[PDB]
Structure formats: structure tokens, C-alpha cells
Amino acid sequence: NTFLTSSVATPPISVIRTGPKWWADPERMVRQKLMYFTLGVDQLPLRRTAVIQRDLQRFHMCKPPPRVGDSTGYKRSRAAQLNTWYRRIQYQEYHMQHLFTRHVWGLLRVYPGNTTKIQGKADDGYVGYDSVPFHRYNRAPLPFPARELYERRK
Amino acid sequence: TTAEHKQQDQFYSPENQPISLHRNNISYMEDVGRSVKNPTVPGL
Amino acid sequence: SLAAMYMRPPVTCYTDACEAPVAMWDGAIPLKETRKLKNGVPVRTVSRTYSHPPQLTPTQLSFNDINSMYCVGNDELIQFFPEGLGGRVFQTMPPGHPRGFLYRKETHLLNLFVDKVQHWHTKRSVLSSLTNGRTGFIVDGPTGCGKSALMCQVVHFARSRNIVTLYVPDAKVWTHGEWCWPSTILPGFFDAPDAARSFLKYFAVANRATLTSWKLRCTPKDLPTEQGERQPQNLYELCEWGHRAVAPASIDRQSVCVKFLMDELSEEKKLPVVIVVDGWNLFSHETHFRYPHPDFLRGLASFNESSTDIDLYPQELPRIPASRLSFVRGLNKMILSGDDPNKFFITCTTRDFKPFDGISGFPNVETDRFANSLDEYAPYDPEKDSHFHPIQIGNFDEYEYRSFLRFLINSGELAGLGWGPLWHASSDFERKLYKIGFLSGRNPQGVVDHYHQELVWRYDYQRTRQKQYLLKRRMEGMSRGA
Amino acid sequence: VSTGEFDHPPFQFRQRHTFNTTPLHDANRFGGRTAYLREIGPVNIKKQGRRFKKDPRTVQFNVDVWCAQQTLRKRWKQRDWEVIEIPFRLVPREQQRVIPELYTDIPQMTDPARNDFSNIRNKVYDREELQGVLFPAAGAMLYPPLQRVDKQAMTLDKYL
Amino acid sequence: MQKLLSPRTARHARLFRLAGKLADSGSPGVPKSDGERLVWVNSHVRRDKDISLSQEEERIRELMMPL
Amino acid sequence: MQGGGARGTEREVVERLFRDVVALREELIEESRTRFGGRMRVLWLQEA
Ligand SMILES: Nc1nc2c(ncn2[C@@H]2O[C@H](COP(=O)(O)OP(=O)(O)OP(=O)(O)O)[C@@H](O)[C@H]2O)c(=O)[nH]1
Ligand SMILES: [Mg+2]
């Protein structure tokens, strides 16, 4: 991993709201798929996501279907329910990506960006060479040189 | 039918058999169980 | 949907075990009811339309099998390839998946050739005419056709038939390496110590059977040894002695050991030896190492005035030619000297270089497909640049291409690695085949690549219009029932 | 037809390290050259900075020099050859003509009558065919002659 | 044991004869050699058996489609 | 020959057949690559 510096975390929903621009950008989604496939694990959530989003993109310039007014509000609530389903289908994916990426990085002897967990290796966030001399969230002092997660041979 | 009808009218259009003309349609359906009521914790 | 009726066709292979639960592949690979006759007119048996390609030993592959797909068992894969596989070959073979190989017509040619090498002394005239006097072949083509794969297959054919086989799975581990030491006992030559060590390791464990029978005609019987260790009497024993040591000792040991190993190989005239090198074209020009600036050799008082620039400015010194690598020296020695018709080089080319079109920006580091490619940008002609007989390889023709794609998709789905329950989202096989043809140009690496990318196709309308028609038909049926 | 970046990103609100976004002078752009352009830290505008490092035209010029180096570098790694200056007599039949200087005439075909159409400019000669010409002094040939492949010979690819 | 090279089915035989006839009219791109012609014929027959497979898998898929 | 146990069939007749069969097969193979514009080459490649 080349990008090492401390970062700003964005809530999952705003990441998903980027649609085609980032979250569903074809290019990105394909190399996620590559990671999964190479690990020998089906990519179902990715495929659900890709389906939902593919279709989002196809109809993205159309006006929504005409609404008739109801005291029930069954329509509004069914649209909502469907929507939060899709949101959750994608939360699951977003989680999977962060999960597997961290795990794979643990196998590749990769050091993550500052303040990032790698389950077996760095439990509290890993940090080295931050702009700030302490670990940001522990409030503990950082050693020089940067802490090493892996034994030396390569 | 008229050869004209079968030359010009035998294609998919918003008249004939349109693909959905509207936003926010159902992309993905599956057979699944229902989740618990209010699975989300109210927070912070 | 004939799912719960489905039993599983009992397991003989690694390959037959690669099948996932029915629930996963059910729509994707459709079931059918076949009525045969036992004890009652039928007894309904549910079979799947598709099954993984057969798992076939190299000796079972026949002329009749060309352009078909065959599988390699996982443990045969472990037996025959402890070095690794060719450059990208393993990208089609994740852990659950079956290990496929398209048996091409050139594959059959080299299979015949190797099967003759097995007893060469009888077939000497035949062989020599088949290469036209050169020592083996170099296979060349565009980036991403079957080259590295073809080499894999040759290693498989050779090692299954119990021939002694050097396999260098990627030449770039030598010539474009981690680091480069001057060799210990060969003045003026160089080593790639890491390449060399790993080689000495896997070579030994692959050929161990034959290499333990091999007695040393020339190696010193005095080799330096730690207390409680044994003087090697075999070629295997020697290779062992090469890589089993604590570093730094491994480094000088490996030099000595490679020199003597190659000296031993060139001295064996009766036992067929097949040398497979992937990316020979890296061995025929310079390595990316440069000779150390001479001021590293002369010792120094201050940088202040020695009349030395080594600290001020970087500069390029002439590259070290690969022929000055002690290993490559060994091989060249066997190629160029006549009176060695014991040895067969079946060797390969790699075009894996970074793209350069006349301007280069800086590569975006997030999106770069070429980050692990070489910097080369200089042309290579197998005719002028090697002593081997060149054989050319193209992209798949449609017969190959179809068999290969069918494999990637369907045996992928059977292994639970593909659309699965979502199968109705992707288009039918024919459409995928035609489209992936257009996108890939039928280049094999392109086919693999676009097969993955298919996940993202926007503009495919087939399943949409089909779904629509099936619906209309169901509703007319419901209006006729009414 | 390169995919690489040839343009420095425009100055805006401070970019931060995010999904989908990195800092402007981040170490990952232009192969880490951005070091040269970087003012580290929460820069105090009034008192501190180096003006040229925020200037669009200047910054872009620097980046353009760096790109030029990249291309030059790769064009030279691409050469396997030297230019030797050989007297008119001793040169192969194709160069016995007049050869307009670069960008002077239409890009020129080596030998249309013999069915070779290619830039004479970029035609490269083998050091082994020019041996007699380049090292006349040496007596015995220094490089051993190229061995060539019989394309009429029955070999593995002809299915015999 | 051994396999035979010569055409196995009546189908192979028929296509093999066709390929011969094409070779004798000297049309462009046709294999001159009998081995190549065999490989060609086998490969073709196999391709058509594949096409039939995909058509069957389609007819079956059509019934279990979601809507 | 070598599996029959050398129980005499007039073993020399067997070996005579062997040498003859071999001679004809060689002749036929090499002929298959040489003759008829080499059309039958792959017989030679396969079995030689
Ligand atoms: N099973 C099988 N797969 C193949 C065959 N040829 C190509 N492939 C697949 O397609 C990919 C083609 O990549 P390589 O074979 O590594 O390409 P290459 O010719 O070595 O090209 P460079 O190394 O880039 O010069 C391989 O990784 C295989 O997965 C083949 O003959 N049989
Ligand atoms: Mg390769």
C-alpha cells in the first residue's frame, strides 16, 4: 500500500450515494471482483450490488412513476421499504470490501493507511509516520522508526 | 397486416412494448425472510 | 425445479469434488430428467447438462482431443510444479476451482515431441529434423496468447513421463531481480542469489526421484560443511547442499552450487534433459543491473577531496549482460557447444512489458494494470536473438476460443464462483460468447479479463426483452384459462 | 494513447485523504515528484508559503518538464542501436539515395519497387551484416554470422 | 491401445470429405494437409455439439425464469 | 517372443514375422511423409 497517511472516514451511505462516480464505477467494481475470485470465494454481494446499480444507471434520466394520493400511504411505505432493502444490500457489500481488503493486506505484508485495523496483526489502529507524534486515538506516544507488523524476511 | 405496419411498427417503442419508462423500478427481487422490527439501534 | 431431486455423481477426482451445493448453481447450470430402464420403465434420475472437463494424464491426451479442455488434479499440480506456474497462468485456478488447460494443436505437437525425447537415442534423426539442427524451440507471439501456459503444459508432459526437467517459470526473477552479487568462484560473472536459491530448492524437490540416482562425475568431494552434515553423493544431495543453510552462508554456497550443478548437467550425455525457460528473451539481452561505479572498489578517505562524484550525481554505467550471469552462462555453454545432443530447450518469450506509445504521462497508482510489468520498450526478434528454432503462436481461433470460454463460465458456475442464483441477470452463453469475442479479439488473456469484466456490462438488453416476452405469454395463458 | 496523467490538478478547497480523494501534493502523484511542490502543514498564509508552489501556470510548467523527461527516457530505453557514420560507397543499396532531413519531406518509404514500404528513418541494420564494412582491420570476423531459419524446412510447426 | 485419427462418426466422415473437396478447388485459407483437415473436422463437430448444448440449456432455463 | 516363455513355435518364424512387419511398417511410415505431396505427414509424426 502506497497511501499511508491519516484519513477521513465517510459514513457508508454517503459513499454509496456516489453511484456510478465511485461506488459503482465499473473499473473499481471489477478489481474488487478480482480479489474475491482469486481468493476462491463467490462474489454474491458484489453481484447484487452490480445488478441494483446497473439498473439505477440505465433509468437515471427518467421521471419517477406518477403518484396517486392515498390515506393508507402503502405506496410510499413500499417504495421506502424497497429502498432501504437496497441500501442494506449495499452496506453488506461495502463491509465485505473493507473486510477482505484488510485481511488480504494482512497476508501480503502490506501496511495500511494510518489509524487502520488489521484483525490479526494491528488490533488498535496501525500507525507509523503521522504528522502528529502520538497515536491519534490511543493518545500513546509513537516509536521511531515506524512500528513493524511483520517478521523481517521477504 | 400491411407491409408498412410490419416495416415501421414492429419495433419496441414507448408505444408498442416499452422497457420501463420510469425511474425507481424494481431492479432486484429475491425470496427472503422478513427482518425484525426496528433492527437499527437509535444512536448518539 | 428438480433441485431437491438431485443427487451427486460420486467423486473420483479432485475435479469432481469442485462442485458447489445445488442451491448455488441450479439455474445457472440447468438440471434435466433422464429416463433410462431399470426394474421399471423409468426411475427418474436428475442429471446436470454440463460437467467439468475430464481429468486426463498427459499419456491419455490424444490427437482426437485437440481444441478440447482437460483438467489437472490438484495433487498432480503439486507434484509437477513446485516452482510455480508461468506468469499469469494461475489466475484461472483459485482454490475451489478445477484446474483447466486448453489442449491446443501446438500443445499436441510438443506432447509428441517430448514423448519422443523420452527415448531420444533411438529417435535422434527424427528429433534433429524436427528442430532442424537447433537445440529445441522458442515459442513467440503477442502479449497474452498461450505462451506461458504452453510452457506449463510442456513441464507437465515432461515430468509426468519422468524426464529430468529444469523449469524456470519466470525469467524475470533472474534478470530483473531483487539484487545482484558478483559470483564467488567464477571471476567476472554474477549471480541472482534469491532466484538461484529458490531454483535449487524446487528443482531438487521436483526431480528428486531421478536426481537421487544421479552420481557426481565432477564435483569436489571436499565441500565445506557444518558439523553433523553430509557430503553430497547425488545431484539431489548437491542441490540440497546449495539452499539449506542459514544466511549469509546460503549466498556463497549457492554460487558454488549453481556452477557445479550446470557443470554436472553438461557432463551427462545419456539421460534426456528438458530445459524449460519462460521468457528466454530476457536471458538473451542485458539484465537491469549495472556494473558498480569503480569508486566503490577503490576505498576512500573523505568525500571532500577524492575526486569522486558518487555522492553528488547519479549516473548510468553499462548494463550487465544476462550472459554474464553464472546460471545463464551454464545454459549458453550447453547451447553453443556442439556434442551435447542430450538436451532439449523448449523455451518461451514474454511480451509483458509496460505500454509505451510516444508519450507517457505518469501512471495513476490506484488504476494501473501494468505496475508489475517490466520496463523494456526494446524490440525482440526470436530469429536473430536466439539459437532456438522459432514457433509462432496466435490468438485463439473460434474453435479454441469457444471451448475455453465455455469452460471459464460454466465450470466457474459449477464451482460456486459465478452468477449462481442470480444467473438470470447475465445474458445467455451465445450472446456472452459473441460479445466477449468482439471485446477480446479472442486473445486468451483478453478473454479471461473480459470474462471477469462481464459483471459490469450496461448495454446488454437480452434478458430484459426475454423476461418481458415470458411475462406476456404467461398473462395470455392466464386469460385463456379464465 | 497513454492513460497516464499529464495535467496537474486545479487548486481548490483543501483535498484530504478520503475514499475517492487524495491530497493535492500527495506522494503518489507524478511518481513522488510532488515533493518538489509541497508546502507541508497548516500553512499560515500571512507569514508563510512559497508562492510558486500554489501558482497554476508555474506548477503546470514543472509537471510538463517532468512528463517530457518520462517520454524522453522511455524513447531512449527503446533504442537498441547507435548511429554510425558510414561513407556512401559502403552502405546498402537502399541508402544510396538522397534522404531528406527530418520533417523536411513526406515520411519516406525504403523501397516501394521491392515491396518494402517502411520508414527509412527507422530501419535498423544488423551489426553482423555490416561487419566487413565496420571492422575491416580485424581480419577474422569478430562477430560470428547470424544463423537463419529455413522456412522451407520440415519442422515441428509444419506438422512433420 | 491407441486412438484412431481417421473420422469416427458418419458426421465426421461427411465433413471430412467436404474439407477435401474445398482443398481441391484451392479456395483461400484451406489446410493443404490431411492432419490439419482432421483437426479441423473434429473441432467443427465439437463446436456444433456445443451449440446444441447451449440451446438445450436455454430451453430449460426458460421455464425456471423468475417472472 | 519375450512373454511366450520361449516354448518353441519355431520361434525363428515368429522373429521372421517380427522383422518383416517392422520392415514394412518403417517403409510405409517414411513413405507416408515422403509421397503424395506429404499430405499424410501426421502419420509419420504420430508413429515415427
Ligand atoms: N488452459 C489454458 N489457458 C490458457 C492457454 N493459453 C492462455 N491461457 C489463459 O490465458 C492467459 C494468457 O496468459 P499467458 O499465457 O501468461 O500470456 P503469454 O503468452 O505468456 O503473454 P506474455 O507473458 O504477456 O508475453 C493465461 O494466464 C491462461 O490463464 C492455454 O493454452 N490453455
Ligand atoms: Mg507469459
Automatic annotation (TrEMBL), chain B:
- Native source species: Trypanosoma brucei brucei (strain 927/4 GUTat10.1)
Positions spanned in the full protein: 243 to 286 of 320
Ranges for the region named Disordered are 1-17
UniProt protein name? Mitochondrial ribosomal protein S18
UniProtKB/TrEMBL annotation, chain C:
Q: Does this entry carry the keyword S-adenosyl-L-methionine?
A: no
Residues that hold GTP 1 according to the record: 88-89, 91-92, 100, 102, 143-149, 350-351
Give residues annotated as binding ATP: 91, 102, 144-145, 147-149, 350-351
The record's subcellular location field reads: Mitochondrion
- Chain residues that bind GTP 2: 89, 91-92, 102, 143-144, 147-149, 350-351
Question: Could you tell me the superkingdom of the organism this chain comes from?
Answer: Eukaryota
List of residues binding Mg(2+) 2: 148, 278
The entry's cellular-component GO terms read: ciliary plasm; cytoplasm; mitochondrial small ribosomal subunit; mitochondrion; nuclear lumen
- Any GO MF annotation of the entry: structural constituent of ribosome
Per UniProt, Mg(2+) 1 binds at: 148
Supply the InterPro entries for this chain: Ribosomal_mS29
- What keywords is this UniProt entry annotated with? ATP-binding, GTP-binding, Metal-binding, Mitochondrion, Nucleotide-binding, Ribonucleoprotein, Ribosomal protein, Transit peptide
Transit peptide in keyword set: yes
Cited Pfam families: DAP3
| Similarity section | Belongs to the mitochondrion-specific ribosomal protein mS29 family.
Q: What is this protein called?
A: Small ribosomal subunit protein mS29
Q: What is the protein's species of origin? A: Trypanosoma brucei brucei (strain 927/4 GUTat10.1)
Q: Which gene encodes it?
A: Tb06.3A7.780
TrEMBL record, chain D:
Protein name, as recorded = Uncharacterized protein
Name a GO CC annotation attached to this entry. mitochondrial small ribosomal subunit
Organism from which the protein derives: Trypanosoma brucei brucei (strain 927/4 GUTat10.1)
Question: What domain of life does the native source organism fall in?
Answer: Eukaryota
Q: Name the gene that codes for it.
A: Tb08.4A8.150
TrEMBL record, chain E:
**What protein name does the entry list?**
Ribosomal protein S9
Q: Which organism is it from?
A: Trypanosoma brucei brucei (strain 927/4 GUTat10.1)
Stretch of the intact protein here:
1 to 67 of 443
